[PDB]
Paper text:
To elucidate the structure of the first two 6-cys domains of [name], we expressed [name] [name] (aa 587–889), which contains the first two 6-cys domains and [name] Pro-[name] (aa 532–889), which has a part of the prodomain and the first two 6-cys domains. For [name] Pro-[name], we observed two molecules in the asymmetric unit, which align well with each other and with [name] [name] with root mean square deviation (r.m.s.d.) values between 0.234 and 0.390 Å (over 1876 and 1673 atoms, respectively). There are 15 residues of the N-terminus missing in the electron density of the [name] Pro-[name] molecules. In contrast with [name] [name], the D1 domain of [name] Pro-[name] assembles into a four-on-five β-sandwich in which the prodomain residues wind around the core structure of the D1 domain and contribute one β-strand (labeled iii) to each leaf of the β-sandwich. In our crystal structures, we also observed two prodomain residues that interact with the D2 domain; D555 forms a salt bridge with K841 and D558 interacts with Y842. We identified additional contacts between the prodomain and the [name] D2 domain, which were not observed in either previous crystal structures or an AlphaFold prediction of full-length [name]. As expected, LMIV230-01 formed a higher molecular weight complex with [name] Pro-[name] with all of [name] Pro-[name] shifting to higher molecular weights indicating complete complex formation with LMIV230-01. The binding affinity of LMIV230-01 with [name] Pro-[name] is 3.98 nM and we did not observe any binding to [name] [name], even at a high [name] [name] concentration of 3000 nM. These results suggest that F5 and F10 compete with the prodomain and dislodge it before binding to [name] Pro-[name].
[name] is the largest member of the 6-cysteine protein family with 14 consecutive 6-cysteine domains and is expressed on the surface of gametocytes and gametes. [name] is one of the leading transmission-blocking malaria vaccine candidates in development. In [name], [name]-deficient males are unable to bind to red blood cells and establish exflagellation centers showing that [name] is critical for fertilization and gamete fusion. The 6-cys domain is a β-sandwich fold formed by two β-sheets of mixed parallel and antiparallel β-strands, with typically six disulfide-bonded cysteines that are positionally conserved.
Numbering used by the authors: 555 to 742, 758 to 868, 876 to 887
The structure:
Amino acid sequence: DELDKIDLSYETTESGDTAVSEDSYDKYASNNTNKEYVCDFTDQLKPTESGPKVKKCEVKVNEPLIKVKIICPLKGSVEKLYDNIEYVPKKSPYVVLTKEETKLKEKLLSKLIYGLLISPTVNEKENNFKEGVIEFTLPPVVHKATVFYFICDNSKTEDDNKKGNRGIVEVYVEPYGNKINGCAFLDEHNEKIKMKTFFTQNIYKKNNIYPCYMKLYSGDIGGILFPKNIKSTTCFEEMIPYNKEIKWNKENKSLGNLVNNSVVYNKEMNAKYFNVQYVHIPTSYKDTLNLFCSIILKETSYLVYVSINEE
Ligand SMILES: *[C@@H]1O[C@H](CO[C@@H]2O[C@@H](C)[C@@H](O)[C@@H](O)[C@@H]2O)[C@@H](O[C@@H]2O[C@H](CO)[C@@H](O)[C@H](O)[C@H]2NC(C)=O)[C@H](O)[C@H]1NC(C)=O
Ligand SMILES: [K+]
């Protein structure tokens, strides 16, 4: 579909048309708060008499579940300042740029990093630079170093004898993690192999004997790759303690309600490509729980077991 169609002929360079040499970039780190790394070009690209400059924001990731956020001012949003701004790729963040020879060329981000989460929306607006901001969350595990780029280029905006600047985001993801504690429900080529290697327990449709068992401790990250024919799941909005009596009219209890400061990722299961959810148990949380949820298939259910801080 149009959301992520690659243009194989597109090519640019870091400098674009600015005639600014790479040895003359203004390079700086992303602004990182907890696990959100932000490249904000709101006050970096305005026309000045010494423009164009190149403003290069460097995102360096070596730990799991980092959310990257890039803010690029909209064309026409302020008088004069952004008259000719442009962003590349237009289909960011589904499409990114990577280095090939001296050039930057388009690649599918999801093919680069298995399990990366792109939500359809950012604060109830479409996840696309036309709305001013894009976001994506990196997964619990990354196997190979990956470097990719975005462009937010105001250098063609000319005001009197002033020119805007060209903004670059370089995201450098180093490898981290090995496998995700949890389960992959597989159907039984490159994508099929990844699906088999990323979770500690694989569950095949035929002749499986062990239910999904997610064993978590303080600080740990868990995850599940849900079956393709999933109809619905109560993981993790309705966990049930299976060491207590089950009453179906009891109110629902989420993992978040049961485990203070736990975080669930892609809880709506609307991220593109990957039918996954990740969970993080805080290091603070020290109690023991034994819970289960369920996965209902499309026309038959799967039981899912979660243990937290088992003695
Ligand atoms: C670096 O970022 C902080 C925090 O930014 C906010 O939180 C991030 C996680 C991200 O979601 C950003 O979009 C947010 O703006 C900045 O601090 C804040 O500054 C703004 C504007 O002055 C203010 O409205 C907020 O109240 C401030 N505090 C918080 C907790 O957001 C900080 O200015 C940034 N520093 C630089 C040099 O850019
Ligand atoms: K009973």
